[PDB]
Design a protein around this ligand. Structure first.
Ligand code: DCP
Ligand code: CA
Ligand code: CA
Ligand code: CA
Ligand code: CA
Length: 341
DNA sequence: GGTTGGATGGTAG
DNA sequence: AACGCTACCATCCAACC
C-alpha cells in the first residue's frame, strides 16, 4: 500500500504571491481582522520570509507588527484561496480515483495501483509537483509512505517545497525515534498527558497497560497510537463530505443584551445560508464564545430542512437559552448548520 | 449494557 | 493594551430500549 500526500506551502501567503508577484521576496502576513478596534486580529499564516522571524499563525497582528513592522499585512480572502485549492485538487485527480481531500490545502492519494514501488511514486511525486507549478504556479510538498499518517509525517519532514519517501525501515526507525507529540492527531493536551505518563516516542505505547492509556487519552487515541506503533495503521483513503456550514463573528463589544447580539447572529445566518448553496440542513446550532474565550452552543434538529425564516426564529430561541443557562458575557456569536438532506 | 443525540473537548487547517 | 475563524471526530452524560 502506497500513499502520496500533498500539502501546499504557506498556502494563503503563496496564493497572494502568485496573484501579486510584486510580493515575491518581501515578508507577507495574511491576517484576520476581528474589527473590534483598528488592528485587532490574528494571523492566519505568513510566508517563510516572515515565519523566518517568529511571525507564525495564531499570534496577534499587533504582536507580529512588533517583530516585523515593515512586512506586508494582507486581509484574508478565503474564497480566492478556495478557488485555487479547488483547481489544484482537480489537477490531483488526474493521478488517482482514490483521493481524500483533507483540508483547504491537503490531499491524500492512494496510488497503490498506479505505481509498483517507492521509486516510481517518487517519480510520480515529482511529476505532480511540476504539474501544479505548471498550471497554478503554486509550490507544494509531497510526502510518501505506507499509510496516511506516515505520508503526512513524511511531508512535515520535507516541508518547505520538497518530496520525501518513508520506506518500511524508516517507519520502524520513527516508531522508535519520532517524538509522539509530532504524531498527527496529538495536540498539546494529549502530548502533555502522554509526557505526564512518560511517553515521548511512539514505541513506548507498547510498554504500558492498554486500560491505563485508554484512561488518560480516551479509547480512540489509544487504539490509534498502538495501531501506528505496531506498524499496522492502515486506514483507507476515502472521499470526505462537508458535514457542516457555519459562521461566527466577533462583536464590537461584549454583550448580554439580546437585542444587541441579534444583528450579529442574523449577519451570520445570512452568510451561512449563502454558503449553503442548495444544501438544506435539518440541524441548527447557535455558537457563543464567552468573555474568557470558552465556547457555548445550543442546537436543534428538525424532521425537515430548515428554512431561512426558521433559522431566524430558532437561532433566537436558542440564543435566549444560552443567556438563561450561562451567566458569562458573550464575545462572539454565530451559527452552525448540519445534518443535510 | 449499548445506542443516541446534545454539549462539550481536542485537534488542525 | 486588548488578539481569528472553520470544521472535523471523540467523549461525556443522560434518555431510552
Ligand atoms: N491557524 C491556522 C492554520 C492554517 N490556516 C490556513 C492558512 C494556511 O496557509 C493554510 C494551511 O495551513 P498550514 O499549516 O499548512 O500553513 P501554511 O500552508 O501557510 O504553511 P506551510 O508552508 O507549512 O504549509 O490554512 C489558518 O487560517 N489558520
Ligand atoms: Ca498540513
Ligand atoms: Ca500547508
Ligand atoms: Ca503535535
Ligand atoms: Ca438526550
Amino acid at each position: 500500500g502506497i500513499v502520496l500526500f500533498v500539502d501546499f506551502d504557506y498556502f494563503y501567503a503563496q496564493v497572494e504571491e502568485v496573484l501579486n508577484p510584486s510580493l515575491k521576496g518581501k515578508p507577507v502576513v495574511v491576517c484576520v481582522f476581528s474589527g473590534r478596534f483598528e488592528d485587532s486580529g490574528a494571523v492566519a499564516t505568513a510566508n517563510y520570509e516572515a515565519r523566518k522571524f517568529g511571525v507564525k499563525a495564531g499570534i496577534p497582528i499587533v504582536e507580529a507588527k512588533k517583530i516585523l513592522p515593515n512586512a506586508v499585512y494582507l486581509p484574508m480572502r478565503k474564497e480566492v484561496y478556495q478557488q485555487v485549492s479547488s483547481r489544484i485538487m482537480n489537477l490531483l485527480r488526474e493521478y488517482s480515483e482514490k483521493i481524500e481531500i483533507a483540508s483547504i490545502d491537503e490531499a491524500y492519494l492512494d496510488i497503490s495501483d498506479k505505481v509498483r514501488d517507492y521509486r516510481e511514486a517518487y517519480n510520480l511525486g515529482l511529476e505532480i509537483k511540476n504539474k501544479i507549478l505548471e498550471k497554478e504556479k503554486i509550490t507544494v510538498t509531497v510526502g510518501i509512505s505506507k499509510n496516511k499518517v506516515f505520508a503526512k509525517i513524511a511531508a512535515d519532514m520535507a516541508k518547505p517545497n520538497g518530496i520525501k519517501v518513508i520506506d518500511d525501515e524508516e517507519v520502524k526507525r520513527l516508531i522508535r525515534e519520532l517524538d509522539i507529540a509530532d504524531v498527527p492527531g496529538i495536540g498539546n493536551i494529549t502530548a502533555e498527558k502522554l509526557k505526564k505518563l512518560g511517553i515521548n516516542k511512539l514505541v513506548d505505547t507498547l510498554s504500558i497497560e492498554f486500560d491505563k492509556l485508554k484512561g488518560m487519552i480516551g479509547e480512540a487515541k489509544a487504539k490509534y497510537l498502538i495501531s501506528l506503533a505496531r506498524d499496522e495503521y492502515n486506514e483507507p483513503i476515502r472521499t470526505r463530505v462537508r458535514k457542516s456550514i457555519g459562521r461566527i463573528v466577533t462583536m464590537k463589544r461584549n454583550s448580554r443584551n439580546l437585542e444587541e447580539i441579534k444583528p450579529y447572529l442574523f449577519r451570520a445566518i445570512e452568510e451561512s445560508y449563502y454558503k449553503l448553496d442548495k444544501r438544506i440542513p435539518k440541524a441548527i446550532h447557535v455558537v457563543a464564545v464567552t468573555e474568557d474565550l470558552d465556547i457555548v452552543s445550543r442546537g436543534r434538529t428538525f424532521p425537515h430542512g430548515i428554512s431561512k425564516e426558521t433559522a431566524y426564529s430558532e437561532s433566537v430561541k436558542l440564543l435566549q437559552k444560552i443567556l438563561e443557562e450561562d451567566e458569562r458575557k458573550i464575545r462572539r456569536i454565530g451559527v452552525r448548520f448540519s445534518k443535510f438532506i
